[PDB]
Amino acid sequence: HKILHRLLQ
Amino acid sequence: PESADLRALAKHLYDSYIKSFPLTKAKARAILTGKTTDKSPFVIYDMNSLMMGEDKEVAIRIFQGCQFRSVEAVQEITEYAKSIPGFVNLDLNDQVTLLKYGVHEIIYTMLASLMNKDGVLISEGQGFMTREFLKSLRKPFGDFMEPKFEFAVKFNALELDDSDLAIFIAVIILSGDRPGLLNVKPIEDIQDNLLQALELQLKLNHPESSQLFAKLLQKMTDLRQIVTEHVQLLQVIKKTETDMSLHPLLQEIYKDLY
Numbered sequence: 062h063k064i065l066h067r068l069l070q
Numbered sequence: 071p072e073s074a075d076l077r078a079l080a081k082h083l084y085d086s087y088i089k090s091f092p093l094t095k096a097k098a099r100a101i102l103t104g105k106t107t108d109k110s111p112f113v114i115y116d117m118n119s120l121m122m123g124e125d126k127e128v129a130i131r132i133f134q135g136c137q138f139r140s141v142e143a144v145q146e147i148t149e150y151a152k153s154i155p156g157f158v159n160l161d162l163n164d165q166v167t168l169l170k171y172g173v174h175e176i177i178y179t180m181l182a183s184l185m186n187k188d189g190v191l192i193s194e195g196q197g198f199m200t201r202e203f204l205k206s207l208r209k210p211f212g213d214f215m216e217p218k219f220e221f222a223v224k225f226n227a228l229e230l231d232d233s234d235l236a237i238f239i240a241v242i243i244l245s246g247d248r249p250g251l252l253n254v255k256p257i258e259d260i261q262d263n264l265l266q267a268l269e270l271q272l273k274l275n276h277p278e279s280s281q282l283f284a285k286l287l288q289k290m291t292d293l294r295q296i297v298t299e300h301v302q303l304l305q306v307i308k309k310t311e312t313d314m315s316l317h318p319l320l321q322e323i324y325k326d327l328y
């Protein structure tokens with residue numbers, strides 16, 4: 062779930 | 071009392087809602103009723119008008135359009151979540167899991183602002199794509215959007231406001247009953263506060279309407295299945311279409327989910 066993590070930070 | 075703190079939470083969320091989402095329900099209805107000095111949106115009823123519309127395969131093109139906009143929605147929703155007091159202080163893996171399950175529930179919820187019986191506002195209120203035209207698309211794409219329309223006609227009946235929606239959305243995000251959460255207590259702690267803020271909101275903003283709050287929590291449970299149905303039709307579309315490429319972010323969400 063990289064993008065979601067990237068979006069969250 | 072606490073009542074003050076709940077009004078304070080309501081405004082905070084409305085403000086971050088209104089920042090995060092450029093086309094509010096108010097703006098959207100204004101366009102749809104025609105009660106605005108802007109140009110009425112370019113109606114799309116068939117392949118010809120679609121083609122003339124592009125200025126401002128077919129079924130795959132529309133779904134590719136639908137898909138690119140879904141991603142912007144997720145970006146906006148994720149931004150809004152961060153403004154929900156205490157959402158960010160949660161475990162980052164929980165943050166991810168709440169969003170993973172929530173986004174499509176919220177997309178449905180907020181799509182309804184953009185639609186009526188006959189069609190849906192697209193491209194930031196500048197296009198109006200008809201329900202008749204989306205039905206007429208061939209399987210599986212014909213009946214992809216119809217369930218959203220059916221939900222929306224019932225949901226919109228509740229006549230909710232942008233202020234009501236701002237809290238409702240926050241409540242949907244912070245659902246502690248999502249599969250795979252690691253620390254449910256703090257999630258529930260906040261959803262309690264939000265639900266109270268929601269209950270007050272509705273009492274104040276809709277004093278004429280009693281038990282909107284109750285009706286509204288009933289919808290929130292329909293939505294989970296409606297979102298399941300939706301996720302299954304993405305599983306159908308991914309598999310049967312070799313020509314159709316799903317977008318990455320949408321994979322992340324779709325994968326392992328129901």
Ligand SMILES: *c1ccc([N+](=O)[O-])cc1C(=O)Nc1cccc(OCc2ccccc2)c1
Pocket residue numbers: 091133136137139140143146147176177178180181304320
């Ligand atoms: C279309 C096609 C595929 C998917 N998918 O998740 O695989 C989704 C969609 C889709 O319908 N997304 C969509 C369509 C129309 C509007 C929209 O954004 C509305 C919105 C904006 C801001 C907040 C909440 C919802 C998304």
